[PDB]
């Protein structure tokens, strides 16, 4: 039974449609899973991944991601701020460096050297809610 | 968090995992999503799995590497996910923790395009899209 | 990097792993030493293992979790370390790399106080200190 | 065959003597492995661990460590600067937070809130060698 994609939670249904655009045309699983999750990182209303993501307690939106292909090539970024698409920066760690995981400032520094630019990932909604949590 | 794994028309596996983490977490906190034996593991000879649940607990059990080795040992994706979660429950019990406070779940896929999923607690769903179309199933 | 695992007189296992990492690495680079399935894994019902070698390669194979599951499947510490490394060698050949460019090794301990170690390349040593004394052995 | 300690590389011998001071007295494996590796983090001569560790390419000394006891309690810090003893900060992550891994600035921020001292971990020797590598 191939191609076939599985993803977590309800946003995974809509993510699965983007991934299937690659898979149904006989494309690589790697490009498919990357396209699939990017949809959710891109969505401001998807508050648990990328751009809509709720911040840490100090109000900084830090993102974590990793990717792994069919032949043990892997890439990860963790606690990276300002890059809406951590899965692609992770993909670039994998394909473009001798390393496999970059975290914090160094992850952003690498992202920017690869042409990703800084965006504001804290939506007004998430700043509002963080400031409600700060009272509670 | 969204975790995604796939088998393409060549029969190759790959996966991706992405999150903003625990809301209002300590600064610099990292969960299971960028850790290869924990949030995501893929072996194109056996299968792939991604995790859901509390990041800390998935790190602690290196759950997704466990799921893929259980498929290596001869379990289907469904059996691997279930047996993985059942070991994790025994560990939560060994640590004297209340199971209601812990949630860990996995979705798994093997080379044949067989898939499965299982969780400590109810309330998680996952989407499956093959040639029978896109559907949301419940572990 | 120094990785250390131990069994105390109560018959309990624990371990620690610490490094400054690869010299002149990219900023923010981390290897296997902070990662639980990779640089260090301990299960008190089974055994413990710590890794040596190229951080990237240990992350990629979740090596130390593999060693402890192989001990869980009946291998002695020595057999677990060897079988783990032998799987890793088969993976770097699937990646078309040269083995001389890869180094991954493990030291392992089980609940009985049995220990073992194995590496891809020669040149690694590890220290063992039990009641008979302290000694530097070679995998 | 208990107690028994194993550590990596030839420097593991001297580390093993510190760990054995705990173990021979019927001490906990956890305190033993922590005491054992701290010796090496403390030594400016052991330039692959802690103080004296060779820096990243921009000259920053960044340390990584994790600890795990007999009942699945774990703690990690990664890419942390200025704290001579990352294994104890990792131990504090384990015993003092609801989390299991802190990286970058947040790891140092936590270390300092736990009373750890901020230090300069780059030895003159390692700055010298980094500046030789920068030419080569």
Curated annotation (Swiss-Prot), chains A, D:
It comes from the Bacteria. This is Glycosylasparaginase alpha chain. It comes from Elizabethkingia miricola. The lineage of its organism: Bacteria, Pseudomonadati, Bacteroidota, Flavobacteriia, Flavobacteriales.
